[PDB]
């Protein structure tokens, strides 16, 4: 599972999207972190089989 | 005010020929931020070889912008005649966040003379001119493009060797062809190269003088000049505004050869610029002296996050518009122009609201207008279920002195549909405004009137005019300033605070109007009531000329039994997609005629959370709702060959459309169909078996090599 | 307000300076305590993997070890140990039939 | 398992878990089709 | 105040609207970041297993 | 105020005999919420299965 | 040092040569300034304490 932040928070409302743009570092570190988690897990699947 | 030189002494203006079709050309020069087109350097600080993601005002990748071209005028062999211009003066644009301008890009190439399309010439750079301001309208003959009050004018002069910036009232002049005269078509500026651009003696006021023929400049607060060295080099110009004034940017002084824009002026213009136009210039050449003048291009600015690549010497030679597409996002959402090769999830693509269903006549404010508003501690309560309200109607009767809300706004409380609107009204003096507060521990909140803290609330102070006569005034304003009982003596005494939506326990002993300021009331308690005494004290404020009242509104804000709707086919069935707006709650859903689970007497159904899944309200059927449609898109980046490929999550080969127009976010500004083993992909081709296997190794089993 | 001291010397107040600073200390020290919890996590997992490395040195490096991967991919023959940054590093020399 | 949707379960839930409706969160497919994990084992 | 957008229109004034919404973004994104830490935990333990 | 019909024209009331001991009975019918005795349905919204 | 609107504590050195040179700081991807400008006119690049 990967969350698509900047549209999880928020629901897609433009003022809330701008208040996310204040926090544009944290969301990048979220989806960066999960994509890293899926590559580690996917290499566990690949290396397993 | 500043002396800007004499008015024109001419009694007429030069005639102007508007022929827009001669200026309608397709010469595309879109923004390419890969080459750092249209980049203002950051104001706050400056940087070395560092790359970064940065949010600021930028044009968007691929924006073609607005193109403008200036032309030689009409002429015989010997004599310049009518000016020759496009329709730019009537095309007033919204300033918004400002804009950047690509200047001189075609210089040195061969192009048409415009007024004589069959004649080609070497293209020379020409500088743009702008009119900006706060208020616009029409000239006396009805034509658009008139700027009112102080207007900012940016006007190059001296055959492209200076920029003039000035802020004046523009008084239209009344001679023939002038904007307040007969035979007006458009204003314009001009210069006459045979006499204005002779070697060593450029006329530094030629364009200014031409402008002064169409307008008298009045009450100028400033007129600045900026010298420009003559060349045919491409340049960028930018303009923004803050509370500090209007900021001008150029590549000329700091990055002449590279194009980065830096601030060179702040103009003391503090009235917000809302509008601008391009001032047409025409060159009064004779036929044998006709040149082609480089088109310029205006691109609007907006707040965007870019990934900025700074060289060692500090300049920006590379950027990425992160929101352009998922591939750029991946590149960026990482702070690198390069994003290692893999699958990167970019957000939806949520569907557009269409068929906004509203469900709910006229709310009865009657008994408020007829009689005497009681005292705050005897506040009368009007309840509202299942009706339409015009509240701005009600608040147009009274003169309103204060409007504050809690957990809502006055704007919002007029608009939204609330099933229960409780209206509490009473007499109340404006002098005691500081005591009628949701954040107050005065006597009013303690002993008289308290709103709920769990619902959104509003508090209104008003004044009945004279015009309103069915509302009668009482002897004075009265309120309770003490409500307490000591006890059978015991060890303690307490002061009683009413729960929201209740009267004071002292209303049984305090008269409906207090006879005199400071009167006190007592009542011995029965052993069953607790014994001891009940005690109160009343205060008065002198009656006013016009009666003054207090209104307390409470909205629910409670999911069921919600009906109330505002007063103003499509707002009913069959809106079988997003959106609805029920009186009870907002939301975005896809209604379907489902079966058959509910209560059916009150009219929602939830599923163990705040959400409603979802039928009711229709009359009478089961329109069960769902959550919003979102296409869970992604990006298949492959940085080795630099070929993105947008994959959708699990739907659909049949439901999507290319550059889909039913959905919100690409993300966000711009986008850019084969499946169907996993989901839908915007990438050819079908299997193609079987290799190798390796990364970048997409989902269920497309192993997707490149190219 | 976080210019490395809330209202450092240069801006106001003196009374509210303790309020903004106590925001910055509660937050900054709390996130430091998150760093300490993280160091305990990667320390414990590093000790698990170090005990695995001791299990890979005593099996795969001294002896042969007649077992599959761990001693990666093929009937294992030799294995060599070199110190990597923060860890060991193995150069398992396995057979590959083909 | 109430999941998954791969070009039949998104539409199949649209005919009516919500990894494809909040969005929001989103579940990625597990790198291997079931016939192929079946081929390994 | 958390009706999925904090006082988007009706429920509070736009200038404060940013106050309640920024509560909801700091909280909702912080708990999302707790979810990301949890995915790293069960991902690492899943790779051990 | 509302018209609720005329006052009584009677000049006396019917005599009332209070005999509490005749009404003192033990007929227990305690709340059994297993059978949903005494349940008000929630006001705010309504629900399925 | 104590420059224009900025405080700080640094060890200036005559370094080379990276900046903007028109406006007068240089940052490195954070709030910090690394660090020349302002002197007239040379490169006094600063460091942390």
mmCIF file of C-alpha atoms in Angstrom, chain B residues 59-252:
data_model
loop_
_atom_site.group_PDB
_atom_site.id
_atom_site.type_symbol
_atom_site.label_atom_id
_atom_site.label_comp_id
_atom_site.label_asym_id
_atom_site.label_seq_id
_atom_site.Cartn_x
_atom_site.Cartn_y
_atom_site.Cartn_z
ATOM 1 C CA UNK B 59 5.226 30.397 -15.976
ATOM 2 C CA UNK B 60 4.127 26.857 -16.736
ATOM 3 C CA UNK B 61 5.970 24.427 -18.958
ATOM 4 C CA UNK B 62 4.780 24.580 -22.553
ATOM 5 C CA UNK B 63 2.744 27.773 -22.134
ATOM 6 C CA UNK B 64 2.536 29.462 -25.504
ATOM 7 C CA UNK B 65 1.634 32.758 -23.824
ATOM 8 C CA UNK B 66 0.185 35.724 -25.686
ATOM 9 C CA UNK B 67 2.021 36.985 -28.735
ATOM 10 C CA UNK B 68 2.239 40.668 -29.677
ATOM 11 C CA UNK B 69 3.719 42.282 -32.774
ATOM 12 C CA UNK B 70 4.410 45.922 -33.675
ATOM 13 C CA UNK B 71 4.403 47.114 -37.293
ATOM 14 C CA UNK B 72 5.667 49.803 -39.629
ATOM 15 C CA UNK B 73 2.862 52.245 -40.378
ATOM 16 C CA UNK B 74 1.287 53.193 -43.662
ATOM 17 C CA UNK B 75 3.552 55.231 -45.891
ATOM 18 C CA UNK B 76 4.074 56.529 -49.367
ATOM 19 C CA UNK B 77 7.558 56.627 -50.829
ATOM 20 C CA UNK B 78 8.176 59.905 -49.004
ATOM 21 C CA UNK B 79 5.647 60.343 -46.236
ATOM 22 C CA UNK B 80 4.520 58.340 -43.227
ATOM 23 C CA UNK B 81 0.746 58.185 -43.016
ATOM 24 C CA UNK B 82 -1.730 56.320 -40.771
ATOM 25 C CA UNK B 83 -0.360 54.203 -37.947
ATOM 26 C CA UNK B 84 -0.837 50.451 -38.402
ATOM 27 C CA UNK B 85 -1.690 48.449 -35.298
ATOM 28 C CA UNK B 86 -3.401 45.419 -33.823
ATOM 29 C CA UNK B 87 -6.500 45.598 -31.588
ATOM 30 C CA UNK B 88 -4.419 45.414 -28.390
ATOM 31 C CA UNK B 89 -5.748 48.542 -26.655
ATOM 32 C CA UNK B 90 -9.242 47.116 -26.241
ATOM 33 C CA UNK B 91 -7.911 43.788 -24.959
ATOM 34 C CA UNK B 92 -7.647 44.426 -21.246
ATOM 35 C CA UNK B 93 -6.143 41.525 -19.325
ATOM 36 C CA UNK B 94 -6.261 40.565 -15.644
ATOM 37 C CA UNK B 95 -2.909 41.194 -13.972
ATOM 38 C CA UNK B 96 -3.304 38.464 -11.327
ATOM 39 C CA UNK B 97 0.226 37.629 -10.119
ATOM 40 C CA UNK B 98 1.982 39.419 -12.954
ATOM 41 C CA UNK B 99 3.825 38.124 -15.971
ATOM 42 C CA UNK B 100 7.127 37.585 -17.767
ATOM 43 C CA UNK B 101 7.991 38.591 -21.307
ATOM 44 C CA UNK B 102 10.222 37.035 -23.960
ATOM 45 C CA UNK B 103 11.713 39.930 -25.938
ATOM 46 C CA UNK B 104 13.551 39.917 -29.238
ATOM 47 C CA UNK B 105 13.704 36.143 -29.755
ATOM 48 C CA UNK B 106 13.472 36.272 -33.557
ATOM 49 C CA UNK B 107 16.013 39.091 -33.946
ATOM 50 C CA UNK B 108 18.434 38.566 -36.889
ATOM 51 C CA UNK B 109 16.166 36.093 -38.674
ATOM 52 C CA UNK B 110 14.212 37.016 -41.799
ATOM 53 C CA UNK B 111 10.540 37.897 -41.492
ATOM 54 C CA UNK B 112 7.686 39.840 -42.993
ATOM 55 C CA UNK B 113 7.160 43.613 -42.602
ATOM 56 C CA UNK B 114 3.562 42.908 -41.447
ATOM 57 C CA UNK B 115 1.883 45.846 -43.177
ATOM 58 C CA UNK B 116 3.305 44.540 -46.449
ATOM 59 C CA UNK B 117 3.262 40.731 -46.080
ATOM 60 C CA UNK B 118 5.008 40.112 -49.417
ATOM 61 C CA UNK B 119 8.008 42.136 -48.226
ATOM 62 C CA UNK B 120 10.618 40.465 -46.039
ATOM 63 C CA UNK B 121 13.315 42.054 -43.918
ATOM 64 C CA UNK B 122 15.818 41.264 -41.204
ATOM 65 C CA UNK B 123 14.039 41.161 -37.865
ATOM 66 C CA UNK B 124 15.135 43.637 -35.191
ATOM 67 C CA UNK B 125 14.345 43.496 -31.482
ATOM 68 C CA UNK B 126 11.660 45.887 -30.293
ATOM 69 C CA UNK B 127 10.642 46.624 -26.710
ATOM 70 C CA UNK B 128 7.088 46.140 -25.408
ATOM 71 C CA UNK B 129 4.982 48.845 -23.739
ATOM 72 C CA UNK B 130 2.357 48.289 -21.041
ATOM 73 C CA UNK B 131 -0.489 50.150 -19.397
ATOM 74 C CA UNK B 132 -1.411 48.877 -15.900
ATOM 75 C CA UNK B 133 -3.897 49.979 -13.307
ATOM 76 C CA UNK B 134 -6.655 49.384 -10.807
ATOM 77 C CA UNK B 135 -9.769 50.462 -12.649
ATOM 78 C CA UNK B 136 -10.803 50.262 -16.306
ATOM 79 C CA UNK B 137 -13.735 51.052 -18.561
ATOM 80 C CA UNK B 138 -14.703 52.585 -21.858
ATOM 81 C CA UNK B 139 -13.807 55.777 -23.665
ATOM 82 C CA UNK B 140 -16.513 58.302 -24.512
ATOM 83 C CA UNK B 141 -17.310 56.685 -27.896
ATOM 84 C CA UNK B 142 -17.756 53.346 -26.120
ATOM 85 C CA UNK B 143 -14.484 51.630 -27.046
ATOM 86 C CA UNK B 144 -12.757 49.587 -24.348
ATOM 87 C CA UNK B 145 -9.285 50.142 -22.956
ATOM 88 C CA UNK B 146 -9.611 53.246 -20.799
ATOM 89 C CA UNK B 147 -7.681 53.223 -17.528
ATOM 90 C CA UNK B 148 -9.060 55.389 -14.694
ATOM 91 C CA UNK B 149 -7.318 57.203 -11.844
ATOM 92 C CA UNK B 150 -3.562 56.723 -11.500
ATOM 93 C CA UNK B 151 -2.204 54.466 -14.194
ATOM 94 C CA UNK B 152 1.221 52.866 -14.505
ATOM 95 C CA UNK B 153 2.771 53.226 -17.936
ATOM 96 C CA UNK B 154 5.929 51.351 -19.034
ATOM 97 C CA UNK B 155 7.116 52.959 -22.253
ATOM 98 C CA UNK B 156 10.440 52.356 -24.012
ATOM 99 C CA UNK B 157 11.986 55.274 -25.874
ATOM 100 C CA UNK B 158 15.011 56.599 -27.701
ATOM 101 C CA UNK B 159 15.031 53.878 -30.359
ATOM 102 C CA UNK B 160 15.283 51.228 -27.665
ATOM 103 C CA UNK B 161 17.838 52.934 -25.418
ATOM 104 C CA UNK B 162 15.710 53.662 -22.362
ATOM 105 C CA UNK B 163 12.650 52.537 -20.449
ATOM 106 C CA UNK B 164 10.346 55.130 -18.907
ATOM 107 C CA UNK B 165 8.115 54.171 -16.005
ATOM 108 C CA UNK B 166 5.524 56.676 -14.828
ATOM 109 C CA UNK B 167 2.378 56.786 -12.727
ATOM 110 C CA UNK B 168 -0.154 59.443 -13.684
ATOM 111 C CA UNK B 169 -3.777 60.162 -14.324
ATOM 112 C CA UNK B 170 -4.325 59.806 -18.079
ATOM 113 C CA UNK B 171 -6.629 62.538 -19.319
ATOM 114 C CA UNK B 172 -7.902 61.600 -22.769
ATOM 115 C CA UNK B 173 -7.425 64.420 -25.267
ATOM 116 C CA UNK B 174 -10.188 65.703 -27.518
ATOM 117 C CA UNK B 175 -8.661 66.408 -30.945
ATOM 118 C CA UNK B 176 -9.471 64.337 -34.040
ATOM 119 C CA UNK B 177 -8.485 60.656 -33.605
ATOM 120 C CA UNK B 178 -7.726 61.286 -29.919
ATOM 121 C CA UNK B 179 -9.560 59.166 -27.280
ATOM 122 C CA UNK B 180 -12.048 61.922 -26.285
ATOM 123 C CA UNK B 181 -12.296 63.252 -29.821
ATOM 124 C CA UNK B 182 -14.014 62.362 -33.071
ATOM 125 C CA UNK B 183 -12.895 59.475 -35.322
ATOM 126 C CA UNK B 184 -11.193 57.604 -32.475
ATOM 127 C CA UNK B 185 -10.121 54.048 -33.288
ATOM 128 C CA UNK B 186 -7.265 53.226 -30.907
ATOM 129 C CA UNK B 187 -4.558 55.138 -29.079
ATOM 130 C CA UNK B 188 -0.970 54.128 -29.821
ATOM 131 C CA UNK B 189 2.599 55.272 -29.575
ATOM 132 C CA UNK B 190 5.025 55.849 -32.407
ATOM 133 C CA UNK B 191 8.414 57.108 -33.375
ATOM 134 C CA UNK B 192 9.763 58.346 -36.674
ATOM 135 C CA UNK B 193 13.088 56.721 -37.403
ATOM 136 C CA UNK B 194 14.272 59.122 -40.130
ATOM 137 C CA UNK B 195 14.234 61.972 -37.589
ATOM 138 C CA UNK B 196 14.264 60.166 -34.238
ATOM 139 C CA UNK B 197 16.954 57.541 -34.723
ATOM 140 C CA UNK B 198 19.752 59.348 -36.516
ATOM 141 C CA UNK B 199 23.270 58.409 -35.470
ATOM 142 C CA UNK B 200 24.372 60.117 -32.257
ATOM 143 C CA UNK B 201 21.090 61.978 -31.824
ATOM 144 C CA UNK B 202 18.354 59.554 -30.783
ATOM 145 C CA UNK B 203 15.151 61.287 -29.703
ATOM 146 C CA UNK B 204 14.734 60.145 -26.102
ATOM 147 C CA UNK B 205 11.195 61.513 -25.926
ATOM 148 C CA UNK B 206 9.748 60.338 -29.255
ATOM 149 C CA UNK B 207 7.419 57.678 -27.844
ATOM 150 C CA UNK B 208 6.571 59.774 -24.793
ATOM 151 C CA UNK B 209 5.637 62.675 -27.062
ATOM 152 C CA UNK B 210 3.392 60.451 -29.171
ATOM 153 C CA UNK B 211 1.701 59.195 -25.998
ATOM 154 C CA UNK B 212 1.157 62.794 -24.848
ATOM 155 C CA UNK B 213 -0.774 63.452 -28.065
ATOM 156 C CA UNK B 214 -3.448 60.937 -27.003
ATOM 157 C CA UNK B 215 -3.340 61.687 -23.239
ATOM 158 C CA UNK B 216 -2.472 64.602 -21.000
ATOM 159 C CA UNK B 217 -0.421 63.330 -18.077
ATOM 160 C CA UNK B 218 -1.760 64.649 -14.783
ATOM 161 C CA UNK B 219 -0.582 64.431 -11.173
ATOM 162 C CA UNK B 220 2.327 62.129 -11.881
ATOM 163 C CA UNK B 221 3.831 60.774 -8.672
ATOM 164 C CA UNK B 222 7.006 59.614 -10.407
ATOM 165 C CA UNK B 223 8.685 59.331 -13.777
ATOM 166 C CA UNK B 224 11.802 57.131 -13.787
ATOM 167 C CA UNK B 225 14.128 56.341 -16.675
ATOM 168 C CA UNK B 226 16.358 53.293 -17.108
ATOM 169 C CA UNK B 227 19.083 53.379 -19.735
ATOM 170 C CA UNK B 228 19.436 50.438 -22.114
ATOM 171 C CA UNK B 229 22.482 49.541 -24.173
ATOM 172 C CA UNK B 230 21.586 48.963 -27.845
ATOM 173 C CA UNK B 231 21.899 45.354 -29.057
ATOM 174 C CA UNK B 232 19.880 42.547 -30.685
ATOM 175 C CA UNK B 233 20.226 40.105 -27.782
ATOM 176 C CA UNK B 234 17.247 38.079 -26.511
ATOM 177 C CA UNK B 235 16.012 39.236 -23.133
ATOM 178 C CA UNK B 236 13.405 38.602 -20.460
ATOM 179 C CA UNK B 237 11.325 41.157 -18.570
ATOM 180 C CA UNK B 238 9.082 40.506 -15.571
ATOM 181 C CA UNK B 239 6.623 42.359 -13.349
ATOM 182 C CA UNK B 240 5.028 41.488 -10.014
ATOM 183 C CA UNK B 241 3.453 43.427 -7.154
ATOM 184 C CA UNK B 242 3.531 43.233 -3.388
ATOM 185 C CA UNK B 243 2.509 45.578 -0.596
ATOM 186 C CA UNK B 244 5.931 47.182 -1.154
ATOM 187 C CA UNK B 245 4.946 48.247 -4.660
ATOM 188 C CA UNK B 246 5.411 47.118 -8.259
ATOM 189 C CA UNK B 247 8.597 45.148 -8.936
ATOM 190 C CA UNK B 248 10.323 45.209 -12.327
ATOM 191 C CA UNK B 249 12.658 42.384 -13.408
ATOM 192 C CA UNK B 250 15.107 42.051 -16.276
ATOM 193 C CA UNK B 251 17.797 39.703 -17.505
ATOM 194 C CA UNK B 252 19.760 42.674 -18.912
#
